[PDB]
Amino acid sequence: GKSAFRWVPQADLALLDPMFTTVAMTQVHAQLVFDTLFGLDSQYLPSPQMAAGHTSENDGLLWKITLRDGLAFHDGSPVRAQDAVASIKRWSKRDLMGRSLMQATESLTALDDKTIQFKLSKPFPLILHALGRQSGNMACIMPERLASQPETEAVKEMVGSGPFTFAAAKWVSGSRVVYEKFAGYVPRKDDRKPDFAAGPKIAHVDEVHWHIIPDRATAIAALQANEVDGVEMVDSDFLPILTQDPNIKLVKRSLPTIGVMRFNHLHAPFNNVEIRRAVLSVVNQTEYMTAMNGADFPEYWSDRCGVFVPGSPMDSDAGMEKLTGKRDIEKARAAIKAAGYNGEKVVLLDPVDFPTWHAAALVTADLFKRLGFNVDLQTMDWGTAVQRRNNQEPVSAGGWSVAFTGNTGPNNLDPAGHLPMRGNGKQAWFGWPTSERLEQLRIDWFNAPDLDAQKKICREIQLQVFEDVPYIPLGATYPVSALRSEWKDFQPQMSLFYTLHKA
Prior knowledge:
The chain is α+β, with helices and mostly antiparallel strands. It contains 15 helices and 19 strands. It is classed as structural genomics.
């Protein structure tokens, strides 16, 4: 009699503590079992979820957050402010955003069992954005007895307040994970349409069953045979069959993989900003996306990708002509020669066993040869290339010059966790670009008073990325999930099992 949603995750579930690890499947698990003080909508803006509201006083140095009525943990005990305080303190040990919030917090206390109080040293306008984090790491609320565990010891007992309970006796490694609708869950008021994690969270199925199927062809066959209801990760090879199947609905997920060309900024030739800007002037995202993804399903990639997720609030047209304008090879060749390039060996790391990034390496090798570079395209396994790109030494000592990879997830929405834009030198992501401007602009975004101010700073960040070229975006590739056609309102921002429904 129980209704169930049968789900094929992209990987098995290995860890249960959402504060302990950022791995994708733990964060999906977390959105079934736990809840957050604030949710994010499709514009990734915060709104009350477990909270009823908030107040800001004393010139933004004193914040009060009130819990709404009807919150309960899966053991029946109500959620209090003391549980939220203990959860936030533990969550802030490993979460980047929570760490920044508590660095600005003088004291975090519960005034009663319903009101949370932040006493701030300096203003932190991103406090609601912080407490609204949905993944990596979800700002999940646990009972104080569990939130008091050390941040270095992963929590094993699953007691959340979210719309599903974790059936621990049904977690079978390599085979099954089972979640059961929390009968005691009281969704917040229905004053807005459910949208990502904003509005009421309603479970419309009695159970969610993860079917672990490592063979991707087997998983697709189960979906077409109506043996499962959804598959998290659909490879491009299966796009023709699934598009033709009228019983299957393909879901373009909201957050893409932004492909990046990453230089080694520590040695010639890409320690020279004029050479980096010359390469930027001939990168054609249409060519990269066509080679990496094919031309048959262009609805799942974008060739107009700047620093941030295309179409998201921080995205803008600032300086985008640096990518969308004419790709002039002759002028770029002349600029590289004028900059002083003299045939130095340029090592490209080619991961032959990773098809998309192998394709990006091949496009770049041909482009660099036409630019006049002395190209050394080194073929290796992806795991080898990941080790090689950590070397900071020059090419003469076995070093590298260009590498190719992708950045996924909400980090690409804003400067907080954005990896390639960072400019703190040898403390930055591999490649180690130095841009004091980009570092200061990121800090400016943290201190920005409102959304309009944040957007203006992210325009400047994009202008500065094109000027200093810490990396070059190659395009955005959107992952795809597949569902049986009867399932509606599946949220595309994250694999979520509330809101979705059949009837």
